């Protein structure tokens, strides 16, 4: 039960904040919150411990704090060596064990701020015959590389049936990601329309499909 945002941007040198939202069973109790930095492929290094203390060889740039039921990490003086995933970690009593966060993808800039570029394909007839249905949501040419998809059937979100891919570097050095939705054929037919909405940092980009 520790909630961190998915992504945060930032230009070299600017200051950025990462939030570690917790409940009363983990940070609300007397338990301390630590942070960990995971560079690509590398294993996590210990970062801020004891909510504000940093171990040897950690710059002043990284500064931790904690307030009530949440914690916060602060990075000032962004460099390329800082682009990584960051995790907060504390202890929970109602679960009787330690707990980590979801992680936050720190993207340092140095590129434009392009967005998707979503294209959505509805189920093909040939697969409806085989008693199957799968909608295909494609995303290309976006920077930085961290999106958040959400599927709807003309009003209502769909929690199950969704498989979402990890972004990866394009040849055009940008990022690319796809997400597929699995449906039964009559579920596809017995609805007005469907929509794959994709949120990049501050923009929702949505497509739409209707049975014909």
């Amino acid at each position: 039960a520790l909630t961190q945002p998915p992504s945060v941007s930032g230009a070299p040198g600017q200051r950025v904040t990462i939030s570690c939202t917790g409940s009363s069973s983990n940070i609300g109790a007397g338990f301390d919150v630590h942070w960990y930095q995971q560079l690509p492929g590398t294993a996590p290094k210990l970062l801020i411990y004891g909510n504000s203390f940093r171990p040897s060889g950690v710059p002043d740039r990284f500064s931790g704090s904690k307030s009530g039921t949440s914690a916060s990490l602060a990075i000032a003086g962004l460099q390329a060596e800082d682009e990584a995933d960051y995790y907060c970690q504390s202890y929970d009593s109602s679960l009787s064990g330690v707990v980590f966060g979801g992680g936050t993808k720190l993207t340092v800039l140095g590129q434009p701020k392009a967005a998707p570029s979503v294209t959505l394909f509805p189920p093909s007839s040939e697969e409806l015959q085989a008693n199957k249905a799968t909608l295909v949501c494609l995303i290309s040419d976006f920077y930085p590389g961290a999106v958040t998809v959400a599927w709807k059937a003309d009003s209502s979100p769909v929690k199950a049936g969704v498989e979402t891919t990890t972004p990866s570097k394009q040849s055009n050095n940008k990022y690319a990601a796809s997400s597929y939705l699995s449906l039964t054929p009559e579920q596809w037919k017995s609805h007005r329309s469907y929509s794959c909405q994709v949120t990049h940092e501050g923009s929702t980009v949505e497509k739409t499909v209707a049975p014909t």
Binding site: S25, A29, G30, F31, S93, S96
Partner: protein, 53 residues
């Protein structure tokens, strides 16, 4: 039992946890209570679990 001829010096401690939850983590739910007593000493100790700096 102080089996010797000089007087003995007995020293113990009380653990003040950071919260009512950490105390249940270490020792379990319930009120924690230490009772010390000799032929002339009669006291009792209770931890004070709560927030601190």
């Amino acid at each position: 039992k102080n089996t010797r001829k000089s007087p003995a010096l007995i020293v113990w401690g009380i653990h003040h946890s950071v919260s009512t939850a950490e105390q249940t983590k270490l020792y379990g739910s319930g009120n924690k209570l230490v009772t010390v007593g000799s032929s002339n000493y009669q006291q009792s100790f209770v931890p004070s679990p709560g927030a601190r700096p």
